[PDB]
Swiss-Prot record:
Activity response to pH changes: Optimum pH is 7.3.
Binding-site residues for substrate, renumbered to this chain: 32, 104, 117, 132
Top-level lineage group: Viruses
GO annotation, biological process: cell wall macromolecule catabolic process; defense response to bacterium; peptidoglycan catabolic process; viral release from host cell by cytolysis
Entry similarity comment: Belongs to the glycosyl hydrolase 24 family.
Catalytic-site annotation from UniProt: 11 (proton donor/acceptor), 20 (proton donor/acceptor)
InterPro entries: Endolysin_T4_type, Glyco_hydro_24, Lysozyme-like_dom_sf, Lysozyme_dom_sf, Phage_lysozyme-like, T4-type_lysozyme
Result after altering residue 11 to N: Loss of 84% of enzymatic activity
Cellular component terms per the entry's GO annotation: host cell cytoplasm
Protein name, as recorded: Endolysin
One Gene Ontology molecular-function label: lysozyme activity
Keywords: Antimicrobial, Bacteriolytic enzyme, Cytolysis, Glycosidase, Host cell lysis by virus, Host cytoplasm, Hydrolase, Viral release from host cell
Organism: Enterobacteria phage T4 (Bacteriophage T4)
Annotated phenotype, changing residue 117 to F: 10-fold decrease in enzymatic activity
Length: 164
């Protein structure tokens, strides 16, 4: 399993504009278009993102391209972040994937605010950090996905995703 397959399991694939768990306008493989309430603002972002007139609809191909960009940007963001980089560097390949998934879902900023868990992750206190990560809006709002990611940090392997 790899980062793309893992995220693709968590996010899904929709070729028509849709709403987030959060109510936000999205398309493809979890690509947020706008946090604005108008479908029209969304459409516009969409066409800006793709370089064509899409009329709210994209191809598989366009979805994966956006996905390639998004993943690349998540990793580069982690690398640039003073709070994130040190943790990322300290982790093994599998756990690195779990951080990357959090970053993709919630942005650099959001994750960098998980101060205490980050600390425990750096320290390799897997069980403690899993307990701390669960005490969040993130877990309460998207418990099945949060639990998959959390198991991944706890175990260091891909079993939470085997099922799926």
């Amino acid at each position: 399993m790899n980062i793309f397959e893992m995220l693709r399991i968590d996010e899904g694939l929709r070729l028509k504009i849709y709403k987030d768990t959060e109510g936000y306008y999205t398309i493809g493989i979890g690509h947020l278009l706008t946090k604005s309430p108008s479908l029209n603002a969304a459409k516009s972002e969409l066409d800006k993102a793709i370089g064509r007139n899409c009329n709210g609809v994209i191809t598989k191909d366009e979805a994966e391209k956006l996905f390639n960009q998004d993943v690349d940007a998540a990793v580069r963001g982690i690398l640039r972040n003073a709070k994130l980089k040190p943790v990322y560097d300290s982790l093994d390949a599998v756990r690195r994937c779990a951080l990357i998934n959090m970053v993709f879902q919630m942005g650099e900023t959001g994750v960098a605010g998980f101060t205490n868990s980050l600390r425990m992750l750096q320290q390799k206190r897997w069980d403690e950090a899993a307990v701390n990560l669960a005490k969040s809006r993130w877990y309460n709002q998207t418990p099945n996905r949060a639990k998959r990611v959390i198991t991944t940090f706890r175990t260091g392997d891909w079993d939470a995703y085997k099922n799926l």
